[PDB]
Amino acid sequence: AIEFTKYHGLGNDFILIDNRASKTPAITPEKAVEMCDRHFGIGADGVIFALPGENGTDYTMRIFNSDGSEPEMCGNGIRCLAAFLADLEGLSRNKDTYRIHTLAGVITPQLTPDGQIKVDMGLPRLLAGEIPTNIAAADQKVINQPLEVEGKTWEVTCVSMGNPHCITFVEDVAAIPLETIGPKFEHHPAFPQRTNTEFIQVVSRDYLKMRVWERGAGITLACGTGACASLVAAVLTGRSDRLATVELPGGPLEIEWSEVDQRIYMTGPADRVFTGKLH
Amino acid sequence: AIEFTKYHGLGNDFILIDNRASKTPAITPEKAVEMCDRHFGIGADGVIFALPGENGTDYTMRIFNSDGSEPEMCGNGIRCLAAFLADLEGLSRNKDTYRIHTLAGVITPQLTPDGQIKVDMGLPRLLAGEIPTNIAAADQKVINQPLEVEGKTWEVTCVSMGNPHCITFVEDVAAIPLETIGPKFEHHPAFPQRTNTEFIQVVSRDYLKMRVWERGAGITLACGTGACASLVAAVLTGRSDRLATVELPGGPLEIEWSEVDQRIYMTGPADRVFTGKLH
Ligand SMILES: *C[C@@](N)(CCC[C@H](N)C(=O)O)C(=O)O
Ligand SMILES: C[C@@](N)(CCC[C@H](N)C(=O)O)C(=O)O
Secondary structure, three states, X not given: OXXXXXXXXXXXXXXXXXXXXXXXXXXXXXXHHHHHXXXXXXXXXXXXXXXEOOOOOOEEEEEEEOOOOOOOOXXXXXXXXXXXXXXXXXXXXXXXXXXXXXXXXXXXEEEOOOOOEEEEOOOOEOEHHHOOOOOOOOOOEOOOEEEEEOOEEXXXXXXXXXXXXXXXXXXXXXXXXXXXXXXXXXXXXXXXXXXXXXEEEEEEXXXXXXXXXXXXXXXXXXXXXXXXXXXXXXXXXXXXXXEEEEEEOOEEEEEEEOOOOOOEEEEEOOEEEEEXXXX | OOEEEEEEEOOEEXXXXXXXXXXXXXXXHHHHHHHHOOOOOOOOOEEEEEEEOOOOOOEEEEEXXXXXXXXXXXXXXXXXXXXXXXXHHXXXXXXXXXXXXXXXXXXXXXXXXXXXXXXXXXXXXXXXXXXXXXXXXXXXXXXXXXXXXXXEEEEEEEEEOOOEEXXXXXXXXXXXXXXXXXXXXXXXXXXXXXXXXXXXXXXXXXXXXXXXXXOOOEEOOOOHHHHXXXXXXXXXXXXXXXXXXXXXXXXXXXXXXXXXXXXXXXXXXXEEEEEEEEO
16 A cells, blocks of 8 residues: 655665655565565665654655665665655745755755755764774774775775765775675674775776675665765875765766865765555 | 556566557567666566457467567466456456467466466477577487586576476575576577576475576576476476476476376466556
8 A cells, every 4th residue: 555656866776655644654674675675575775754854854864774774864865855855845845955854964955957966965974983883992083994804804994974884995896796795894893883885996086986785785876875985085095086976886976075064965866767556 | 657567476576567458569678678677667577568369369468578588478477467467357357267379379377266376388398499409409309418508518408388498407506606607508509599597406206496597587586487397307307297396486386297288387376566657
């Protein structure tokens, strides 16, 4: 009986649920796992709920990963939700921005004239205790630090965008055996709440190629928080400028670590694919 | 604007289109590829059209694989189509069987009282010219014959159920590196029209475990024609009885090589997942 709309942001695909009638998500994590199953269900990297605003926000977003876990933010999902909300509001919409409550804090997507969505993703979180990771002391940053994974030592940088990211810079990202090594990063003991893992090939100081093994979703075609975190990591390690294209398997995102306010801005598309109803 | 219903037969999942208004399929193979894309489209192993009957048949089935190619039959798809047709006919349905025209010939699914669908899949085709394959002369069978794949020689048996199958018996089907070796069977030069490839572990004379690399669809969770062909191969090679369970990753099928009429009967489920409309 559940009605939904399928979206994707650069092939990071989501089931969107109009949940404006209640602050309680209309499906359980267990049901979301069934729904995200690509053969037996709808198939998605996650379920995103459009929920009532909290205080001084227009709406709230909660997201369940395809493994049923609930992360604190999702950049591609915020873009999809912004597009969904605009569709729900129709001609009642009277602004080009939404203030969206998330577990990580208030996130503000802006619908731009060319059809993209530009998102104020907030300040990046750089201390180990904020990731969280045990690679360093809680009040220390985590920049080009060692992480032993299956007996090979990787150089990693950790950044949180509300959710954890572990970024490593590589010479040939297409050559990374992502299916094998991804889960070994995700579940590494150094990450108490698991991590997302980004492998980054620096093409130039304004162009990064990224592949990701996501916490709770595995190999995805794109990750907005991960692209943000990777850009931050590239700046922290002196490898890139603060404005860059991040090329993902599904396409490009434009990432800016603003010098005006030190917040991360992420611009990309959001596509409506189909509307549906569960049997 | 295209309306569809998502089904799966043991996790071999399909987009079903009500195409009764015209003998022309509502979409092109190119569009089918886009619709079957799991991240950018609906996601499926294929698109199945419920088409008008052809002289002495109730309906016609055409199927596009997720790579856009058009195979001659599909067992999981026929079961899904029979369920779909029963729903479309509703209370106007006046029988428990449909005669369905396919490229392979007339196929007759039967709606059984317990909710399963039992299909008359026709006579198996055993000659090399009928597969087609060049492993043997056109008028010879292909039973426990050699096939070199990447310098390793495999023992194979070929059977056609209207579409080509290449079956090899293994000790541990779970250990087969299917992502790697599957495509090398599929596109082997011995198979002018490519082939479906089944790896079979015989548990007992009435119980086969199957994994499949499908022509035009890759790793799937189930394949009805493939299970049929594998049972035939197991009988031809003396490894199984003519009545067996074939356990697929998505669940079991009951296969019978009837001694009454020498036709193959396949019984299994069909599940309606959701209805949808493209944006
Ligand atoms: C990659 C992304 N969808 C974030 C999804 C949540 C992530 N799997 C986690 O568990 O933290 C996004 O930001 O676009
Ligand atoms: C798996 C299949 N859907 C067959 C699909 C067609 C197959 N991929 C081919 O190209 O012959 C079935 O019989 O259940």
